[PDB]
Amino acid sequence: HMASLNLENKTYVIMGIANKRSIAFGVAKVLDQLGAKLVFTYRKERSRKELEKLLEQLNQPEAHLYQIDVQSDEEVINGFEQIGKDVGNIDGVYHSIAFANMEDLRGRFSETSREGFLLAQDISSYSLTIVAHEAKKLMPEGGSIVATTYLGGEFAVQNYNVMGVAKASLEANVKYLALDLGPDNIRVNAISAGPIRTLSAKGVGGFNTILKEIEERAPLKRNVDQVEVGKTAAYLLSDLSSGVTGENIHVDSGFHAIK
Amino acid sequence: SHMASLNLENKTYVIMGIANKRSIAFGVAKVLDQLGAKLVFTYRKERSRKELEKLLEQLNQPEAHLYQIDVQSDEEVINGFEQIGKDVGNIDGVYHSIAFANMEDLRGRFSETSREGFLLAQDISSYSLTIVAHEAKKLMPEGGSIVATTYLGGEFAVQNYNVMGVAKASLEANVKYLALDLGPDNIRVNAISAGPIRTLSAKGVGGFNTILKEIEERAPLKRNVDQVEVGKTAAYLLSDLSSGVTGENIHVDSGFHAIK
Amino acid sequence: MASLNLENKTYVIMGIANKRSIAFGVAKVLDQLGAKLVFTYRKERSRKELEKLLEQLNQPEAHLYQIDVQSDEEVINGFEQIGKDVGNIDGVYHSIAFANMEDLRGRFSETSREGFLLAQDISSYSLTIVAHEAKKLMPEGGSIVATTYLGGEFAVQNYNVMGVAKASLEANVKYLALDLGPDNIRVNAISAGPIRTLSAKGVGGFNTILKEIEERAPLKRNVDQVEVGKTAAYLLSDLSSGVTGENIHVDSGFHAIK
Amino acid sequence: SHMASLNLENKTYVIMGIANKRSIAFGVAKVLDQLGAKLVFTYRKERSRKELEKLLEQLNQPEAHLYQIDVQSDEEVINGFEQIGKDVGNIDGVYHSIAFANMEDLRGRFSETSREGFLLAQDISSYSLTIVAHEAKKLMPEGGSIVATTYLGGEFAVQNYNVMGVAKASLEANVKYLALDLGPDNIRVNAISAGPIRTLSAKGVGGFNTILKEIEERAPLKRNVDQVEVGKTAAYLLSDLSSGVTGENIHVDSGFHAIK
Ligand SMILES: NC(=O)C1=CN([C@@H]2O[C@H](COP(=O)(O)OP(=O)(O)OC[C@H]3O[C@@H](n4cnc5c(N)ncnc54)[C@H](OP(=O)(O)O)[C@@H]3O)[C@@H](O)[C@H]2O)C=CC1
Ligand SMILES: NC(=O)C1=CN([C@@H]2O[C@H](COP(=O)(O)OP(=O)(O)OC[C@H]3O[C@@H](n4cnc5c(N)ncnc54)[C@H](OP(=O)(O)O)[C@@H]3O)[C@@H](O)[C@H]2O)C=CC1
Ligand SMILES: NC(=O)C1=CN([C@@H]2O[C@H](COP(=O)(O)OP(=O)(O)OC[C@H]3O[C@@H](n4cnc5c(N)ncnc54)[C@H](OP(=O)(O)O)[C@@H]3O)[C@@H](O)[C@H]2O)C=CC1
Ligand SMILES: NC(=O)C1=CN([C@@H]2O[C@H](COP(=O)(O)OP(=O)(O)OC[C@H]3O[C@@H](n4cnc5c(N)ncnc54)[C@H](OP(=O)(O)O)[C@@H]3O)[C@@H](O)[C@H]2O)C=CC1
Ligand SMILES: C=C(CC/C=C/C=C/C[C@H](C)CC(=O)C[C@@H](O)CNC(=O)[C@H](C)[C@@H](C)OC(N)=O)C[C@@H](C)C/C(C)=C/C(=O)O
Numbered sequence A: 001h002m003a004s005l006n007l008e009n010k011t012y013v014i015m016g017i018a019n020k021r022s023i024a025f026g027v028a029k030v031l032d033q034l035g036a037k038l039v040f041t042y043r044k045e046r047s048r049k050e051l052e053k054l055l056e057q058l059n060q061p062e063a064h065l066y067q068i069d070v071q072s073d074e075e076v077i078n079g080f081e082q083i084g085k086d087v088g089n090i091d092g093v094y095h096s097i098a099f100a101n102m103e104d105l106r107g108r109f110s111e112t113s114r115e116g117f118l119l120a121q122d123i124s125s126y127s128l129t130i131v132a133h134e135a136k137k138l139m140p141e142g143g144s145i146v147a148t149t150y151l152g153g154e155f156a157v158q159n160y161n162v163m164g165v166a167k168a169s170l171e172a173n174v175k176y177l178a179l180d181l182g183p184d185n186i187r188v189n190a191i192s193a194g195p196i197r198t199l200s201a202k203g204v205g206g207f208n209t210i211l212k213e214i215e216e217r218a219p220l221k222r223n224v225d226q227v228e229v230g231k232t233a234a235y236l237l238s239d240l241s242s243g244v245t246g247e248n249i250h251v252d253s254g255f256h257a258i259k
Numbered sequence B, D: 001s002h003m004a005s006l007n008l009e010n011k012t013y014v015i016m017g018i019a020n021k022r023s024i025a026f027g028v029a030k031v032l033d034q035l036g037a038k039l040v041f042t043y044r045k046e047r048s049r050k051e052l053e054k055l056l057e058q059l060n061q062p063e064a065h066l067y068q069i070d071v072q073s074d075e076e077v078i079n080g081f082e083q084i085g086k087d088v089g090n091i092d093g094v095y096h097s098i099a100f101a102n103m104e105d106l107r108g109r110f111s112e113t114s115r116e117g118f119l120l121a122q123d124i125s126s127y128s129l130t131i132v133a134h135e136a137k138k139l140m141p142e143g144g145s146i147v148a149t150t151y152l153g154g155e156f157a158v159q160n161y162n163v164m165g166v167a168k169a170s171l172e173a174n175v176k177y178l179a180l181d182l183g184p185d186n187i188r189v190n191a192i193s194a195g196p197i198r199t200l201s202a203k204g205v206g207g208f209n210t211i212l213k214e215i216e217e218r219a220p221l222k223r224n225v226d227q228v229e230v231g232k233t234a235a236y237l238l239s240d241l242s243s244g245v246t247g248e249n250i251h252v253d254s255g256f257h258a259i260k
Numbered sequence C: 001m002a003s004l005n006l007e008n009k010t011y012v013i014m015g016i017a018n019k020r021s022i023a024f025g026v027a028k029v030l031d032q033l034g035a036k037l038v039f040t041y042r043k044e045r046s047r048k049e050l051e052k053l054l055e056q057l058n059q060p061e062a063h064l065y066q067i068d069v070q071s072d073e074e075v076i077n078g079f080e081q082i083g084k085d086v087g088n089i090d091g092v093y094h095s096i097a098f099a100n101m102e103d104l105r106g107r108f109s110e111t112s113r114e115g116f117l118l119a120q121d122i123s124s125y126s127l128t129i130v131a132h133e134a135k136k137l138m139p140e141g142g143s144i145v146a147t148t149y150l151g152g153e154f155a156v157q158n159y160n161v162m163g164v165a166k167a168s169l170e171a172n173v174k175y176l177a178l179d180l181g182p183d184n185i186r187v188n189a190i191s192a193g194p195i196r197t198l199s200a201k202g203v204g205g206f207n208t209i210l211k212e213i214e215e216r217a218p219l220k221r222n223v224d225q226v227e228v229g230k231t232a233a234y235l236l237s238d239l240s241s242g243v244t245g246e247n248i249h250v251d252s253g254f255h256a257i258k
């Protein structure tokens, strides 16, 4: 049609809020301000308590929360079947889910366990494939799926180890989904976020060193936050990004472009 | 109070490279207009000025500000931007939609390309962005956003693109080096890689209809794109929606870049 | 001194199954350059074929070891045993991949969790564990090479789950290169163009892809197992010193065009 | 009888861009010499001819064939290659090790770059390969291999590379478009992306010792590369060992391209 960022009459599933620092919460704040109906997903019960507390910050009249552990085909198939009944058809999904064992992230990459490797692949990459298959059922008119990645999918970064191979997998997942679901007018894209202080990120060594290197070396000489990812998520989830699919947008102050 | 906003009132954007209603830059203009931006326009030929004045009737621009700039001339570019600074004041960004090569060099085997045809393509299609950026910077002391238009032929050897492929590769590196230079001045530099669109430049190149049909057949979205889709992405990149994005190349091409 | 004389060099070659195997192309080439070759196989059908094929080579002593890369034990034990039988090695050529035909025909979005993680296990993780063990036999340094396809870099029709496995493999190579670089171990990939092999025979319209290469690729021709072998020789020898984390396309220039 | 062979007897290679003993192209020459190849050399300045004659004593080249070619001149390039065709006959490939930009443009902020400095860098550092390829093709009716030398700054914005980064991006696209054009004539075109090396061109740029130290600290192999390592990879790419490889860019840089 034309260029509009008015997301009234739009419904978006947002997977992977855990606390106020979660990137997916940044996405939620932004989509909320633009007047979208938001469905939320969580794994742990601690995340449900946090979500209910955080909905007070939003202008969401009715809370729709669904527990989905992406490790379970059943929790994913049932979760999306249930969303279809409770809220009906949706316009897109924001995927903000990743995990690896701290054991495998400290080790030399060559020491990585078969279990730690396939675990990282399962949660951080395959989750997008099954989520896409199910969400498709609620998007007969078309829609937009967005996953969150890191530069470590494209380059060997110190300490990212097994998560780098998971993100490389995720980034190829996005391309293959984009080619598969394109004929159904479903767009699939990734956001490569710069480093952000979150629940997942807190408790890895010298994370403050990486934040300082970005401020020093990145073109914009600053770090990014959850809302900047949110703004780009709005572009990719809305029809502003029509004709964009299989794309990876770096929201990282230009760090990807330098060496 | 809105964090994420596409409200471009109180924003001024220079748009270089409108020639007719089919121009990609016109798609950009229609979109930025609808979002309530003040638009300055640039043209080379007089045919383009006549067309621009006729087309402003389609827009909600109260005052027409047109400036003749041939990007081959340091003086026309330096003077044009000095004049825009006086007439409209400080700007928030520039959309660059300018390219040219001799049809001679685009038909030939790439190895037959003339030194003159090669350096001409570089001058208009790549260096133009460097000098435009240097001058526009003077009108963006608070920061801003520069966007150039490229094609997948900058990244891969495509049949018949020849000398323009090497110009676009040059443009795409230009964007990265400008992004690194002007980043500390809070100026973002990015490119849009547009899929094929029927325009004045594109009409009269061989079997262009073959390329449009291959996109519809092989590209993920099984369809071609238009000037407005480029316009929408231009709005994202020129607005503060794209804050934290610089040195980036967004493919608006129905996913064609992602497949093989 | 620039030399392709591989006397006094020993190379493990994983993934020979028949005479059409890419790894066999690698073996023929390394043999002609006078290298001692250790071989690995999974199925017994592959052992029978290997013994028959060693007659075509100038290998005095046959060293065959059964390793299924799905098993930590078969991989750890296989490489411990190679260390005893032949001693220290100079590199490993990895030519191993697998996915369920089920998942390769389906729309990629239909892919099963089992089919996906299986492809990752054999086609990508195998390189990580192989590298960990082979390192033990390369205290002076060495070269590891894995085989990939352009489908790791771009979505190609019908490659589906194997594309995501190859994307994983190609990142594996980069992360191994960064980890084992300080131990003077180089890790690189060869992106082979399409070749008629046992694995490749019986997948839909493979003859369409071979014809598109001959028509559209810069060299207007397909490649064979030996061309991969020649590039494998470069990457496994010290000719490629200073090259690590690299992906060489042996594909008639197809990767460079669109 | 050897499928895989690095025996370059009965092979003739033109090597453009030796200036002194530290030149990358000299590393290429030493390696190709040891493998028993007939080597033709090219130079611009007379200082380079004196140095070349002195350096031929280090090689096992029976007959010295030196030709002055300034790649800025179509005539010097067309005539030089016509003359090589008469003196030595048909060749098997060309190693291109030629680049230049004004020190003025390499110190400045990239946005300050002059139109003259930009197009000069493009002319010598990129177009030179196109015209050299067109002429050398005439001496390679059976096929052959052309190799150009590039730097990571063609792919990423690196501090201080400025206008040479845009030239190398141009060169790297040149290689792809030449590979597609000359492939049917069985001519392969590839690039080597060398890590940083102490040479005549490189000496006298600021904090070059900082970049060498960052490579030793951060690159996978925790060491820098030299002219011979580039030479070894040049041997692979120029010989038939690299058959089926064209439009490729091999990083000889201790793995630095693969990390971030
Ligand atoms: N923070 C950063 O610097 C960057 C992050 N990213 C990516 O952004 C995404 C989110 O990161 P961030 O916001 O830091 O992470 P958070 O720690 O805030 O959120 C992680 C989320 O993952 C969810 N999760 C983990 N396992 C599962 C599972 N099996 N099923 C469902 N949900 C699960 C968690 O839910 P619960 O805790 O309830 O399981 C949690 O909500 C990730 O994909 C990450 O790779 C990318 C670049 C940078
Ligand atoms: N159409 C397509 O399929 C694609 C186009 N592109 C790129 O999009 C951009 C514009 O193309 P498109 O809109 O189709 O073409 P148009 O024919 O609509 O526009 C070309 C424009 O370039 C201007 N121009 C040319 N030379 C100069 C100069 N020396 N100084 C100032 N202006 C000049 C022309 O002005 P005048 O008429 O006054 O000379 C004209 O307005 C180019 O960068 C092109 O490479 C990228 C991908 C696809
Ligand atoms: N053929 C082609 O066109 C191309 C192939 N490639 C890649 O080249 C490599 C070799 O394939 P190619 O030579 O065609 O196929 P082959 O049929 O020759 O080989 C498949 C090989 O993988 C081995 N293998 C499979 N599973 C396991 C396992 N669990 N443990 C150990 N070995 C295993 C097989 O052994 P067994 O059968 O005895 O189990 C067999 O040797 C693959 O990585 C492939 O993706 C890349 C580009 C093109
Ligand atoms: N050194 C490094 O750190 C790296 C260098 N490279 C590349 O390697 C190549 C050579 O580098 P390096 O060893 O440093 O170079 P050298 O300084 O040793 O040689 C530079 C050469 O360029 C030649 N040249 C310049 N202009 C012309 C012209 N108009 N016509 C003919 N020849 C000309 C010079 O000839 P004369 O002096 O006779 O004018 C000289 O032979 C370049 O392409 C460079 O970009 C790539 C990565 C790293
Ligand atoms: C180079 C780095 C620093 C090392 C970072 C490793 C992070 C990897 C990704 C995941 C998110 C970390 C992870 O698996 C967390 C757990 O091991 C421990 N924490 C938890 O379990 C908490 C309770 C939950 C909520 O976490 C999850 N995921 O469930 C990368 C950084 C520069 C950038 C970065 C941090 C990228 C990224 O997140 O992918």
Ligand SMILES: C=C(CC/C=C/C=C/C[C@H](C)CC(=O)C[C@@H](O)CNC(=O)[C@H](C)[C@@H](C)OC(N)=O)C[C@@H](C)C/C(C)=C/C(=O)O
Binding pocket: B019, B099, B100, B101, B102, B103, B106, B150, B151, B153, B158, B159, B160, B161, B164, B195, B196, B197, B200, B201, B202, B205, B206, B211
């Ligand atoms: C692979 C292709 C197909 C071949 C098309 C090559 C087009 C290259 C673009 C240049 C800019 C065309 C060009 O310079 C045309 C002029 O020589 C003649 N036309 C004019 O002068 C008219 C009057 C004016 C208005 O035109 C200009 N430019 O001033 C590429 C296509 C599939 C995609 C494409 C068309 C890309 C692109 O535009 O860059």
Ligand SMILES: C=C(CC/C=C/C=C/C[C@H](C)CC(=O)C[C@@H](O)CNC(=O)[C@H](C)[C@@H](C)OC(N)=O)C[C@@H](C)C/C(C)=C/C(=O)O
Binding pocket: C017, C097, C098, C099, C100, C101, C104, C149, C156, C157, C158, C159, C162, C193, C194, C195, C198, C199, C200, C203, C204, C206, C209
């Ligand atoms: C686009 C294509 C065409 C579709 C090709 C799919 C091939 C994927 C490769 C995997 C490895 C094939 C595979 O796993 C098939 C098995 O399910 C059954 N085959 C076997 O079991 C045979 C007997 C054994 C030897 O197989 C194995 N692996 O053990 C890709 C092509 C253009 C290029 C190509 C064929 C690339 C590649 O091999 O990866």
Ligand SMILES: C=C(CC/C=C/C=C/C[C@H](C)CC(=O)C[C@@H](O)CNC(=O)[C@H](C)[C@@H](C)OC(N)=O)C[C@@H](C)C/C(C)=C/C(=O)O
Binding pocket: D019, D099, D100, D101, D102, D103, D106, D151, D153, D158, D159, D160, D161, D164, D195, D196, D197, D200, D201, D202, D205, D211
């Ligand atoms: C990131 C960097 C540091 C910035 C320096 C870049 C230098 C690039 C080389 C260019 C070609 C310098 C140049 O144009 C030379 C002249 O301006 C001055 N020198 C000469 O005139 C001598 C006498 C002659 C023989 O040289 C020439 N061109 O003829 C780059 C480094 C990390 C790596 C590097 C320097 C790469 C490279 O060579 O491109």
